[PDB]
Amino acid sequence: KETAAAKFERQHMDSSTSAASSSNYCNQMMKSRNLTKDRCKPVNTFVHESLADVQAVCSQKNVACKNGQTNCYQSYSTMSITDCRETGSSKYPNCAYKTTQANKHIIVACEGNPYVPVHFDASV
Ligand SMILES: O=c1ccn([C@@H]2O[C@H](CO)[C@@H](OP(=O)(O)O)[C@H]2O)c(=O)[nH]1
Numbered sequence: 480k481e482t483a484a485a486k487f488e489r490q491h492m493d494s495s496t497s498a499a500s501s502s503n504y505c506n507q508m509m510k511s512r513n514l515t516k517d518r519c520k521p522v523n524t525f526v527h528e529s530l531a532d533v534q535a536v537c538s539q540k541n542v543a544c545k546n547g548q549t550n551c552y553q554s555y556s557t558m559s560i561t562d563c564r565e566t567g568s569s570k571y572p573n574c575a576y577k578t579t580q581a582n583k584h585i586i587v588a589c590e591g592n593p594y595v596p597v598h599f600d601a602s603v
Pocket residue numbers: 490522523524598599600601602
């Protein structure tokens with residue numbers, strides 16, 4: 480009984496740490512958040528800002544989604560994030576990732592009532 484909003488929080492939110500993600504961060508996080516249960520999710524981004532700040536993006540800059548849909552929004556301010564990218568030698572179930580911190584604008588898709596983030600589209 481996990482909503483799309485809850486799923487977005489599980490896959491993309493990590494407010495706790497003021498971003499100091501070690502080189503082990505993604506290996507631990509991708510596993511702890513169950514993103515390597517059925518397969519090694521190739522790419523996944525974690526946002527370190529507050530839930531309120533990320534939810535607020537749904538009222539910010541409306542931009543086209545990569546899939547052509549029109550319900551994506553870009554944050555006006557840059558946000559602290561951590562990108563997780565599966566390594567080349569990574570082999571399920573032992574999913575391995577490269578951890579890379581960044582400060583960029585995020586683009587999320589929003590749906591529902593309340594209108595909240597349900598998909599992370601990209602960082603720019
Ligand atoms: O910078 C990026 C690009 C893509 N993705 C994620 O990679 C998947 C394929 O695009 C998407 O996950 P989903 O299918 O569960 O919504 C998207 O959120 C990220 O996390 N960060």
